[PDB]
Amino acid sequence: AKRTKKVGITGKYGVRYGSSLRRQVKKLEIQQHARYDCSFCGKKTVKRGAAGIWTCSCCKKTVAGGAYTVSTAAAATVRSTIRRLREMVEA
């Protein structure tokens, strides 16, 4: 049965702190507790602890990421704009 109409995980704060603050948290909180695909071993066992740090359950790899999500859009494009620049120094 559907338990709550919109608060979801954020229901623990109840009525406090104002709907909008709770809404913003619920987003990043959902972002940060989730299980992610592992680049190395191809399973979805990456989880967080200590914002920034993302380690894989098995295969024991630990990746430095964004505070509440593995890849951050900034570091994502930086990856590509470094990929682009690197290729300028071989071809």
Partner RNA sequence: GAUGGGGAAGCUCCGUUUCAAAGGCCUGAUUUUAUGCAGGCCACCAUCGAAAGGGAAUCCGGUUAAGAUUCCGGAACCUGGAUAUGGAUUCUUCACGGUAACGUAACUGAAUGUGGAGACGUCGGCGCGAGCCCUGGGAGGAGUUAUCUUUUCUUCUUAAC
Partner RNA sequence: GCUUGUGACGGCCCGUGAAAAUCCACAGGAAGGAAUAGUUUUCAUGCCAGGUCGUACUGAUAACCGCAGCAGGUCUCCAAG
Partner RNA sequence: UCUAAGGGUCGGGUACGAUCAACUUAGAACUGGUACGGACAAGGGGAAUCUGACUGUCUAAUUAAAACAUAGCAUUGCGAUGGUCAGAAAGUGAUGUUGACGCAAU
Return residues touching Zn ion (CB under 5 A). 38, 40-41, 56, 59
> What 3-state DSSP class applies to 28?
helix
Among 58, 64, 74, 89, binds RNA (CB under 7 A): 74
CA 22 to chain centre: 18
- Nearest residue (CB) to RNA, 30 versus 41: 30
CA distance 90 to 88: 6
- Residues 54-83, interacting with another protein (CB under 8 A): 55, 60-69, 71-72, 74-75, 78-79, 81-82
